[PDB]
RNA sequence: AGAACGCAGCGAAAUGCGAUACGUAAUGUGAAUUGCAGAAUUCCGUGAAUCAUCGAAUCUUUG
RNA sequence: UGAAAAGAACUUUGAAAAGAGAGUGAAAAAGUAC
RNA sequence: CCACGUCAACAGCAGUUGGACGUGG
RNA sequence: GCCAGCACCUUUGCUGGC
């Protein structure tokens, strides 16, 4: 049904993995998706492992809303780092599936490049936050359904 | 020794003789505005329709007790709560409920018939079946020439038999005009089937005779054919849809019966 | 408040709580189910 | 004749089968209209007993549980093997 | 210990105490877990696996 | 003779039928509950409702005889 | 012989009378499992006996 | 815990002992 | 063994705030990580008692700790961090 | 030791005896088959003698005892003269204590389930030491001595008999297929059957029973058929002569085989309703003979163990000459005025009348008593089997019944009640017709695997049933291609 | 199907009278399937209500030539399962395949002693 | 008129009936019923219907 | 959704959810508020 | 509530945890 | 019923105090 969406690959030179209806951010995983990248599966993996320890976050192109005055890095093409480890776990769980569906493939071994990745609106969880006089404002705990595909170069 | 005088034609037949004159009620100017007006008058009387119900309205108690916050009351309507309602529902301004008149009946329309108007309408209709070149225009095909509109025998009443229907239809030729009817374009009509709209088949010819009916049991059925009398006939049978110039077939004794009227109405041009 | 006494009124609403629907799913396969509950 | 059957079914559960072991106590479920006398009479003519105590209480199953203590000489092991 | 919400309550209940005072052995915590009865914690108390403060 | 419904049962008179019925209710009171088992059985369903089907017969004959008197 | 053991052997002889006397394809299966079961036999007691006779040759 | 090779060694050395003696 | 005194005159008088103690346990953890050259640091309930005995406010400043090694190596690292 | 202590356990002598402890590693599938034929190749060496030279020379041991041989899993005059006999016996003893209910155990608790297992293997080694002091009081060896090499001979058999209970365990830990109890019973038939029937003929003489004329199949068929390398001819059919007919022993391995492999093919068919559909479904048969298999092993073992009336333990008190409370009133095992000398009148009418000749029709009285006893013992251990766990009638019927109704989810009916009519009244009598068919096959003749063959070719057709079903319905090289599978539902 | 006229329902209501109204013996009408010409002559009829032991061949559809006994047919769903094909999945998950009765022609019959007596004698409309 | 709470082999949704509890009867019919998992009854004449009966025996509690 | 549930076997991967390839069918960007 | 089994949703993150979910008593 | 000691793997037995 779904994917690539940039159709050319072709599937004898491809590996594929997709998440599906997990409860991890829409807003901060489009930025991770744009920034994985690109870079092999091993380069993407070890970056996001070091992220957990001390290495930000991963550069934010467009979702760079203030925040204080920031920061140190890195800071390649950006200046507004954060540190959500929520979106790190989601993309690590995508990469492990893509690297264990790239282990029977059998292709190998240099090659790679993350050809396309796209994130879908799973939707938004709808919840509420109390405030004043029986009036109540929206609260979202953001989920996403994601798709990941690679091609030999 | 010739005036509107016609030669008889039979279903045997292979004619051999002569017939009574063509009527003077087949003369009068063909007028399409009257033909259409009479056609829509008769079907309006029958027609009615149904639509949304709940009540029409009005589940739903109100007098306009909207509660202001913003943008207004709205403007309208009140009662009330987690529904439904707003407005609503009671609209319009509807995202669920009724329209602004739920189909009303109520709504007196009709056209009441007048004695003079009715006998003008029949006279013009009978002078709209005296053409020839509007038969092709309407959408039915006649190979046969001349003798138009066609004349048939008294033996048309007697049938009954299915195979003598085929024997009649070859003579008036026609024939392939009634094989048009039973063939796709006939197809399937949708939701417009119910009230007739419809999709998309075309009509066949009309047959008329004078004494009878005749309409007997087996003159009912045969595809696209209709059967009528000179005593009782109408513009739904002489031009369905009001696009004048139906292929009409007649039978002798039509002239004499039609001619004598009293009544009081006669040709003028 | 008061009613027609009674312990019995309590008993038949205790049964009703248990008898509540809840729940299963094996018939939602074989219907025509139009989601409910 | 307007009499009813009392015992709809006997209850068997983890606690119910423990009662049988303790002192030959069967435990039943009986009608919502049930009375002490008719429980005493019913178990007499379906198991051949002398009942040594009837007491009844409500259950959220709706049908009224009935605690029925029975004779020592009855032997409730081998007639709870019957049921 | 894991899922010994029940064996804090039951162990406390049989010795009639407030659930703070009751003690569960760390070494034989698995054998406390495998009890799930009120006569299976009589055994544990008598051994000294469960003690009361 | 063999069985148990519906031409043996209907015309049977009637003390005999009552005696049989309550001893087909001791089959199902030895087998209730549980002892259900898990059941259905179509035997249990039929005999549950052949207490129903023939206590309508017993109370019908009593009703009709009182209208013949 | 009272009520209990006559009841016991009533269903104990419906046990022994559900047959299905052996067909010729069940017979083939018996033959090849006592053909395999006669050559499992056929190498074990053969091995023992052949080297048994040399015991009495070597030691008088 | 011993092993399945200790039992194996025991018997084949026992069979050896009996023929030898 | 080795024995060190972790200087808790440094930063552990400037903290408070209110929450000296849960930060303080973490500071000892990564001081002993650097000194011993190890990954995991055990953090005994002996140490936990020793830093919550006076309770937050409420430390006894510098403390003595006895520390051992390591060569296990990463598989099942041993760093005693109490009194060996 | 003693001191002043309250004990009654014999703890300190236990690790002062070199007992056994067992594996450890196991490997399938090519190393199950390799190591369970390796197990049967250590058993195979029954050609080897047993140390003892005044009894291997001139008397060369007394005549073979063909009654013990079939159920022991043994061969006389070798390292494995006892086989499974004390191992199965410690099963008899503790089937008796548990099932009589002098000692009561509920085996669904882990602690006392494995207490039973440990107690059995300890008592198998306790039963081993007393069995090898039984077998030198039998007078089997053709000599009776004071403590010298009669002490050494008993040590050897125990030291290679703790080996044969190790074989049982090693196979059972998953390093072989089946159980090593089943396997050694079904290579007793392998040793005994083709020694008897294929054999080889040799020329020597001997007043006592010797194995000189053996190899009946070759002797019979090739003299009937033509001539061989050996110069033979003529047909020998039946005789009551000293020289064996040869036909007699060929017929009576086949005769039993047909009818005891077909008693397992008589089955108790159990309907279900269904697997996917509403309507009739599987005919689901259960094994008749394999349920009663361990019941009839207990039953047949005890006919060679009782002091009051059995072979081994009355041959002792015939041999031993002080007469007191125990005496040869138990039975007289001595030479007879009869032509063939086996006990003239014992109380062992639980003895099989069969020999490796034809049956005995000369005493109908001993036949009736033998049949009666083993049917009583065949229903004795049938209800001890029911009492002691397994797929218990009470537990399994109860479990699925109340598990099904309220669960998950939920669910409803099983056939369990309607087959609790069929199963427990087919279980007891299923070890009463198994003890009937072993004796009626023995009646025809056959000895030295008389009842070993019967449970070994129907233990070989039990094996066949399991493997064929696995191949053709679970997967492998299969027969599901012809017509399968489960249709119905929508 | 139904013969004109008396009830003048245009209408999806008329369709629902086939779907939901009139079980088994007016699904006699809707499970009837036409006879051959050998067995039209034999019993003098034209069509016969289906038996579960009748053997019937498929004439219309995409599975338009297969014979076989009828495994099941349902009164509610008016649809005939033919034995079989089916169409298996490899673990034995196995499937119905259902058809419409008036897209079939019945070849061999299994008709009974007084099954044909009621059908042949007049018909009706005696329910 | 209407309503409560029950009933079941199961009980999502609908209405079928009343401690006898989707029961069944009297006409009447013909190979499939019990929604299905599942448990079984029937099939060259007594299983099975509201196809048609303002038609029936039983009928709690409230009104 | 489809004529018919044929409502996706089996295999590999994944803590599971799920994914990869594959099966069914006329059509699966007809794969279940379809 | 109580006991046992679970984490899809629900708990303001998270979860090996629950008053949640599900089934007994 | 509660507490303590000794025997006992436990289930229990014995003795003393309240």
Cα distance between residue J368 and residue J47, in whole Å: 39
Chain D residues with CB under 8 Å of C19 CB are 62
User: Tokens standing for G17?
Assistant: 């009378």
Q: So where are chain E's domains?
A: 4-52
Cα distance between residue J82 and residue J128, in whole Å: 8
Distance from CA of J48 to the nearest CA of H (A): 7
DSSP 3-state of K33: strand
Distance from CA of J381 to the nearest CA of F (A): 28
DSSP 3-state of A137: strand
Cα distance between residue J228 and residue J243, in whole Å: 21
Chain F residues with CB under 8 Å of J412 CB are 38, 40
Cα distance between residue J86 and residue J98, in whole Å: 18
Is residue B230 domain-shared with residue B153, that is, in the same domain? Answer: yes
Q: What burial letters (b/e) apply to J422-443, b meaning 16+ CB within 10 Å?
A: bbbbbbbbbbbbbbbbbbebbb
Size of interface F-J (CB pairs under 8 A): 20
Domain endpoint, select from B84, B104, B124: B104
Question: Would you list the DSSP string of J217-261?
Answer: HHHHHHHHH---SS---S------SSS--SHHHHHHHHHHHHHHS
Kindly give the pairing relationship between strand K79-82 and strand I2-6: unpaired
Order the strands of the B150-152 sheet from edge to edge: B150-152, B248-251, B206-209, B226-229
Of all protein residues, which has its CA closest to the C1' atom of N9?
A: A125
Cα distance between residue F30 and residue D46, in whole Å: 9
Q: Is B220 on the interface with K (CB under 8 A)?
A: no
Q: How many of the other CB atoms lie within 10 Å of CB of E27?
A: 7
The answer to whether residue A3 sits within a structural domain is: no
CB-strand contact E35/N, under 7 Å: no
Q: Please name the residue of chain K whose CA is at the shortest distance from the CA of residue J484.
A: K92
Cα distance between residue J21 and residue J169, in whole Å: 10
Sign of the dihedral defined by the CA atoms of residues A55, A58, A60, A65, in that order: negative
Measured CA to CA in angstroms, residue A19 lies from A13, A105, G40, J371 at distances of 21, 19, 57, 72
Q: What is the resolution of this structure in A?
A: 8.9
Give me the long-range contacts of J390-395 (CB less than 8 A, separation at least 24).
J393/J420, J393/J423, J393/J424, J393/J427, J395/J108
Q: What are phi and psi of C8, to 5 degrees?
A: -60, -35
H/E segment holding residue J99: helix J85-100
CA atom of A121 to C1′ atom of M32, Å: 20
Cα distance between residue J193 and residue D47, in whole Å: 61
Q: Alpha helix locations (H) across J346-409?
A: 365-380, 382-387, 393-405
Q: What are phi and psi of J485, to 5 degrees?
A: -140, -165
Task: Estimate the crossing angle of helix J110-134 against helix J85-100, to 10 degrees.
Answer: 130
Domain E4-52, architecture per CATH: Orthogonal Bundle (1.10)
Q: What burial letters (b/e) apply to B76-115, b meaning 16+ CB within 10 Å?
A: bbbbeeeeebbbbbbbeeeeebbeeebeeeeeeeeeeeee
Of all protein residues, which has its CA closest to the C1' atom of M8?
A: K89
Which 8-state DSSP code applies to residue J128?
H
Q: Is K77 on the interface with J (CB under 8 A)?
A: no
Nucleotide nearest to D15 (CA to C1'): N25
CA atom of K118 to C1′ atom of L45, Å: 12
Size of interface J-K (CB pairs under 8 A): 20
The reply to whether residue K94 touches residue J487, judged by beta carbons under 8 angstroms, is yes
Q: How many of the other CB atoms lie within 10 Å of CB of B172?
A: 21
Question: Would you list the DSSP string of K59-110?
Answer: -SSSS-S---BEEEEETTTTEEEESS-----TTS-----EE-GGGEEEEE--
Pick the CATH number of J20-185 from 1.10.520.20, 3.30.420.10, 1.10.3370.10, 3.40.50.300: 1.10.3370.10
Instruction: Scan residues 3-62 of F and list those with Cβ closer than 8 Å to D.
Output: 26, 29-30, 32-35
Chain C residues with CB under 8 Å of D32 CB are 11
Which 8-state DSSP code applies to residue J458?
S
Size of interface C-J (CB pairs under 8 A): 3
Chain M positions with an atom below 7 A of a protein C-beta are 3-10, 12-21, 23-26, 28-29, 31-33
Instruction: Scan residues 79-108 of K and list those with Cβ closer than 8 Å to J.
Output: 84, 86, 88, 91-96
Tally of domains in chain B = 2
G14 sits in the region (left: phi over 0; alpha: psi -120 to 50; else beta) called: alpha
Which domains, from first to last, does chain K contain? 2-127 (2.30.30.30)
Cα distance between residue J372 and residue J366, in whole Å: 10
Cα distance between residue J56 and residue J47, in whole Å: 14
H/E segment holding residue K56: strand K55-58
Q: Are D28 and D43 within 8 A, CB to CB?
A: yes
Bridge partners of residue I66, in order along the sequence? I3, I82
Question: Would you list the DSSP string of chain B?
Answer: --SS-B----SS-S--S-B----SSS-S---HHHHHHHHHHHHHHH-------SSSS-SS--SS----SSS-S-SS-B--SSSS-BSSSS-SS-SSS--SSSS-S---------HHHHHHHHHHHHTSSS-STTHHHHT------SSSSEEE-GGGTT---THHHHHHHHHHS-STTSSSTTSTTS----GGGTTS---------EEEESSS----TTTS-STT-EEEESSS--TTTSSTTS-----EEEETTHHHHHH--SS------
Kindly give the pairing relationship between strand B150-152 and strand A145-151: unpaired
Bridge partners of residue I64, in order along the sequence? I5
**CATH dotted code for D7-70:** 3.30.70.330
F58: Cβ–Cβ under 8 A, 6 or more apart, which residues? F14, F17, F18
Of all protein residues, which has its CA closest to the C1' atom of L39?
A: F40
Nucleotide nearest to A89 (CA to C1'): N14
Measured CA to CA in angstroms, residue J227 lies from G2, J231, J233, J234, J243 at distances of 64, 6, 6, 9, 20
CB-strand contact J402/N, under 7 Å: no
Q: Residue H4's closest CA among B106, J27, G52?
A: J27
Which 8-state DSSP code applies to residue K2?
P
J245: Cβ–Cβ under 8 A, 6 or more apart, which residues? J236, J237, J238, J239
Bridge partners of residue A144, in order along the sequence? A22
Q: What are phi and psi of A138, to 5 degrees?
A: -65, 150
Q: How many of the other CB atoms lie within 10 Å of CB of J399?
A: 12
CB < 7 A contacts with chain O (nucleic strand):
E 39, 42-43, 46-47; J 5-6
Is residue B179 domain-shared with residue B152, that is, in the same domain? Answer: yes
Cα distance between residue J308 and residue J325, in whole Å: 12
Which 8-state DSSP code applies to residue J371?
H
Domain that holds residue A62: 10-153
Cα distance between residue B91 and residue B52, in whole Å: 13
Bridge partners of residue I81, in order along the sequence? I67
Residues of J 263-292 whose CB lies less than 7 Å from any atom of strand L: 271-280
DSSP 3-state of K47: strand
Cα distance between residue J429 and residue G8, in whole Å: 9
CA atom of B243 to C1′ atom of M16, Å: 72
Q: Please name the residue of chain J whose CA is at the shortest distance from the CA of residue F43.
A: J418
Given a contact as 3+ CB pairs under 8 Å, which chains touch J? C, F, G, H, K
Cα distance between residue B248 and residue J284, in whole Å: 80
Q: Residue K38's closest CA among K115, K118, K112, K109?
A: K109
Domain that holds residue B75: 51-104
Q: Is B194 on the interface with K (CB under 8 A)?
A: yes
Cα distance between residue J427 and residue J387, in whole Å: 12
Q: Residue B143's closest CA among B179, B113, B114?
A: B179
CA atom of A19 to C1′ atom of N20, Å: 26
The reply to whether residue F29 touches residue D46, judged by beta carbons under 8 angstroms, is yes
Instruction: Specify the length of chain H in residues.
Output: 21
Q: What are phi and psi of J129, to 5 degrees?
A: -70, -35
Q: Are A6 and A115 within 8 A, CB to CB?
A: yes
Of all protein residues, which has its CA closest to the C1' atom of L21?
A: F52
Is residue B88 domain-shared with residue B122, that is, in the same domain? Answer: no
Is residue B100 domain-shared with residue B221, that is, in the same domain? Answer: no
Q: Residue E35's closest CA among E22, E23, E21, E50?
A: E50
Mutate one of D56, D58, D62, D63 to test the C interface: name it (highest C CB count within 10 A): D62
Q: So where are chain J's domains?
A: 20-185
Which 8-state DSSP code applies to residue G1?
-
Q: So where are chain F's domains?
A: 2-69
Distance from CA of D62 to the nearest CA of C (A): 5
Residue B180 sits at the vertex; the CA angle it makes with B178 and B183, to the nearest 5 degrees, is 115
Cα distance between residue J70 and residue I3, in whole Å: 76
Bridge partners of residue A118, in order along the sequence? A147
Cα distance between residue J312 and residue J232, in whole Å: 42
Using what technique was this structure determined?
A: cryo-EM
Q: Is J485 on the interface with K (CB under 8 A)?
A: yes
User: Tokens standing for D65?
Assistant: 């549980």
The reply to whether residue F34 touches residue J414, judged by beta carbons under 8 angstroms, is no
Q: Alpha helix locations (H) across chain A?
A: 29-34, 41-53, 86-98
CB-strand contact E36/N, under 7 Å: yes
K126: Cβ–Cβ under 8 A, 6 or more apart, which residues? none
CA atom of K92 to C1′ atom of M8, Å: 14
CB-strand contact A20/N, under 7 Å: no
- The three-state DSSP-derived secondary structure of B177-223 is CCCCCCCCCCCCCCHHHCCCCCCCCCCCCEEEECCCCCCCCCCCCCC
Q: Are B93 and B86 within 8 A, CB to CB?
A: yes
Chain J residues with CB under 8 Å of K86 CB are 487
- The three-state DSSP-derived secondary structure of chain E is CCCCCHHHHHHHHHCCCCCCCEEECCCCHHHHHCCCCCCHHHHHHHHCCEEEC
Is residue B136 domain-shared with residue B214, that is, in the same domain? Answer: yes
Cα distance between residue D26 and residue I51, in whole Å: 62
The reply to whether residue J21 touches residue H2, judged by beta carbons under 8 angstroms, is yes
Chain B residues with CB under 8 Å of K11 CB are 194
């Amino acid at each position: 049904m779904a994917r690539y969406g940039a159709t050319s690959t072709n599937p004898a030179k491809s590996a594929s993995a997709r998440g599906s209806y997990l409860r991890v951010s829409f807003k901060n995983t489009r930025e991770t998706a744009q920034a994985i990248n690109g870079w092999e599966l091993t380069k993407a993996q070890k970056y996001l492992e070091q992220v957990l320890d001390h290495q930000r976050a991963i550069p934010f192109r467009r979702f760079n809303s203030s925040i204080g005055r920031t920061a140190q890095g890195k800071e390649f093409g950006v200046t507004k780092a954060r540190w959500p480890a929520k979106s790190v776990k989601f993309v690590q769980g995508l990469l492990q599936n893509a690297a264990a569906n790239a282990e029977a493939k059998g292709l190998d071994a240099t090659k790679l490049y993350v050809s396309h990745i796209q994130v879908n609106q799973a939707p938004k969880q709808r919840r509420r936050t109390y405030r004043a006089h029986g009036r109540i404002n929206k609260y979202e705990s953001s989920p996403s359904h994601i798709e990941l595909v690679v091609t030999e170069k | 020794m010739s005036r509107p005088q016609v030669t008889v034609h039979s279903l045997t037949g292979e004619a051999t003789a002569n017939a009574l004159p063509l009527p003077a009620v087949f003369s009068a100017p063909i007028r399409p505005d009257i033909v259409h007006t009479v056609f829509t008058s008769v079907n309006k009387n029958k027609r009615q329709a149904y639509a949304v119900s709940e009540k029409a309205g009005h589940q739903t108690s109100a007098e306009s007790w909207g509660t202001g916050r913003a943008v207004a009351r709205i403007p309208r309507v009140g009662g009330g709560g987690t529904g439904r309602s707003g407005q609503g529902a009671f609209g319009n301004m509807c995202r669920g409920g009724r329209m602004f008149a739920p189909t009303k009946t109520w709504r007196k329309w009709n056209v009441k018939v007048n004695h003079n108007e009715k006998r003008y309408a029949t006279a013009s209709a009978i002078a709209a079946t005296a053409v020839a070149s509007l038969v092709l225009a309407r959408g039915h095909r006649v190979e046969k020439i001349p003798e138009i509109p066609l004349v048939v025998s008294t033996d048309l009443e007697s049938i009954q038999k299915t195979k003598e229907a085929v024997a009649a239809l070859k003579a008036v030729g026609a024939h392939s005009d009634l094989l048009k009817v039973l063939k796709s374009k006939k197809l399937r009509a949708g939701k417009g089937k119910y009230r007739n709209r419809r999709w998309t088949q075309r009509r066949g010819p009309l047959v008329v005779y004078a004494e009878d009916n005749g309409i007997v049991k087996a003159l009912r059925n045969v595809p696209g054919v209709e059967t009528a009398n000179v005593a009782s006939l109408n513009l739904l049978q002489l031009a369905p849809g009001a696009h004048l110039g139906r292929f009409v077939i007649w039978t002798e004794a039509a002239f004499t019966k039609l001619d004598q009227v009293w009544g009081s109405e006669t040709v003028a041009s | 408040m008061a009613a027609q006494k009674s312990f019995r009124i309590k008993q038949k609403m205790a049964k009703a709580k248990k008898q509540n629907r809840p729940l299963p799913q094996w018939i939602r396969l074989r219907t025509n189910n139009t989601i409910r509950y | 004749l307007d009499s009813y059957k009392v015992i709809e079914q006997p209850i068997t559960s983890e606690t119910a089968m423990k009662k049988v072991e303790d002192g030959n106590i069967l435990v039943f479920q009986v009608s919502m209209k049930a009375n002490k006398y008719q429980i005493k009479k019913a178990v007499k003519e379906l198991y051949e007993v002398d009942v040594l105590k009837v007491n009844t209480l409500v259950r959220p199953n709706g049908t009224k549980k009935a605690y029925v203590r029975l004779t020592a000489d009855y032997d409730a092991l081998d007639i709870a093997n019957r049921i | 210990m894991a899922n010994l919400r029940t064996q804090k309550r039951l162990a406390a209940s049989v010795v009639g105490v407030g659930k703070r005072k009751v003690w569960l052995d760390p070494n034989e915590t698995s054998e406390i877990a495998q009890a799930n009865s009120r006569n299976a914690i009589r055994k544990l108390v008598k051994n000294g696996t469960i003690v009361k403060k | 003779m063999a069985g148990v419904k519906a031409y043996e049962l209907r015309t049977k008179s009637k003390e005999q039928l009552a005696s049989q019925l309550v001893d087909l209710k001791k089959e199902l009171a030895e087998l209730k509950v549980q002892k259900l088992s898990r059941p259905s059985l179509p035997k249990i369903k039929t005999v549950r409702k052949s207490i129903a089907c023939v206590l309508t017969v017993i109370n019908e004959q009593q009703r009709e005889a009182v209208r013949q008197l | 012989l009272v009520e209990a053991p006559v009841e016991f052997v009533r269903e104990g002889t419906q046990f022994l009378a559900k047959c299905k006397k052996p067909d010729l394809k069940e017979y083939t299966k018996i033959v090849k499992a006592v053909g395999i079961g006669f050559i499992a036999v056929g190498i074990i007691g053969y091995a023992i006996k052949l080297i048994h006779i040399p015991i009495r040759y070597v030691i008088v | 815990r011993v092993d399945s090779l200790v039992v194996l060694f025991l018997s084949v050395g026992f069979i050896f002992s009996v023929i030898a003696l | 063994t080795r024995e060190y005194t972790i200087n808790l005159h440094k930063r552990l008088h400037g903290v408070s705030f209110k929450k000296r103690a849960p930060r303080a346990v973490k500071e000892i953890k990564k001081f002993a990580k650097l000194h011993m050259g190890t990954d995991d640091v055990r953090l005994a309930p002996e140490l936990n008692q020793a830093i919550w005995k006076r309770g937050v406010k409420g430390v006894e400043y510098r403390l003595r700790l006895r520390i051992s090694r390591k060569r296990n190596e990463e598989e099942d690292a041993k760093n005693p961090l109490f009194s060996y | 030791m003693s001191g002043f202590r309250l004990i009654d356990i014999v703890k300190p002598i236990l690790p002062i005896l070199p007992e056994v402890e067992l594996p450890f590693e196991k490997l399938p599938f090519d190393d199950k088959i390799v190591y369970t034929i390796f197990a049967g190749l250590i058993y195979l060496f029954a050609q080897f003698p047993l140390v003892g030279l005044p009894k291997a020379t001139t008397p060369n041991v007394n005549d073979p005892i063909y009654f013990l041989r079939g159920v022991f899993g043994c061969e006389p005059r070798t390292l494995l003269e006892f086989g499974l006999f004390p191992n199965i016996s410690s099963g008899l003893i503790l089937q008796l204590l548990a099932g009589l209910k002098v000692i009561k155990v509920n085996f669904k608790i882990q602690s006392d389930r494995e207490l039973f297992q440990s107690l059995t293997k300890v008592f198998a080694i306790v039963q081993y030491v007393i069995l090898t002091n039984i077998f030198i009081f039998a007078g089997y060896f053709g000599d009776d001595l004071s403590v010298v090499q009669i002490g050494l001979i008993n040590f050897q058999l125990v030291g290679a008999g703790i080996f044969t209970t190790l074989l049982a365990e090693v196979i059972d830990k998953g390093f072989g297929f089946s159980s090593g109890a089943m396997i050694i019973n079904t290579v007793v038939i392998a040793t005994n059957l083709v020694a008897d029937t294929f054999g080889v003929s040799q020329i020597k003489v001997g007043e006592d029973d010797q194995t000189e004329a053996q190899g009946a199949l070759i002797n019979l068929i090739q003299g009937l058929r033509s001539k061989h390398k050996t110069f033979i001819g003529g047909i020998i059919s039946a005789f009551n002569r000293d020289y064996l007919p040869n036909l007699t022993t060929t017929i009576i391995v086949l005769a039993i085989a047909i009818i005891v492999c077909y008693l397992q093919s008589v089955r108790v068919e159990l309907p279900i309703r269904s697997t996917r559909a509403r309507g009739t479904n599987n005919v689901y048969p259960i094994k008749l003979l394999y349920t009663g298999c361990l019941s009839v092993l207990f039953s047949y073992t005890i006919l060679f163990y009782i002091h009051i009336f059995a072979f081994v333990l009355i041959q002792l008190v015939a041999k031993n000459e002080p007469t007191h409370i125990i005496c040869k009133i138990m039975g007289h095992y001595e030479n007879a005025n009869n032509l063939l000398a086996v006990p003239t009148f014992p109380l062992s009418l639980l003895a099989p009348p069969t020999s490796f000749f034809k049956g005995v029709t000369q005493q109908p009285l001993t036949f009736i008593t033998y049949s009666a006893f083993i049917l009583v013992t065949g229903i004795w251990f049938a209800d001890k089997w029911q009492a002691i766990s397994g797929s218990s009638a009470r537990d399994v019927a109860l479990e699925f019944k109340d598990q099904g109704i309220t669960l998950m989810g939920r669910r409803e009916q099983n056939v369990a009640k309607e087959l609790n009519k069929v199963i427990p009244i087919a279980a007891v009598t299923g070890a009463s017709v198994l003890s009937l068919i072993t004796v009626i096959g023995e009646s025809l003749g056959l000895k030295g695997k008389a009842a070993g063959i019967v449970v070994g070719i129907a233990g070989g057709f039990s094996l066949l049933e399991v493997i064929t079903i696995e191949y053709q319905q679970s997967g492998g090289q299969s027969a599901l291609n012809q017509v399968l599978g489960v249709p119905g539902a929508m | 199907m139904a013969k004109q006229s008396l009830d003048v329902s245009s209408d999806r209501r008329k369709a629902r009278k086939a779907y939901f109204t009139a079980p088994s013996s007016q699904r006699r009408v809707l499970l009837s399937a036409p006879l051959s010409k050998e067995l039209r002559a034999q019993y003098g009829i034209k069509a016969l209500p289906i038996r579960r032991d009748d053997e019937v061949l498929v004439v219309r559809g995409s599975k338009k030539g297969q014979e076989g006994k009828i495994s099941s047919v349902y009164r509610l769903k008016f649809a005939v399962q033919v034995d079989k094909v089916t169409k298996e999945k490899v673990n034995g998950a196995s499937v119905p395949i259902n058809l419409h009765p008036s897209k079939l022609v019945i070849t061999k019959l299994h008709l009974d002693k007084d099954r044909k007596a009621l059908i042949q004698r007049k018909g009706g409309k005696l329910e």
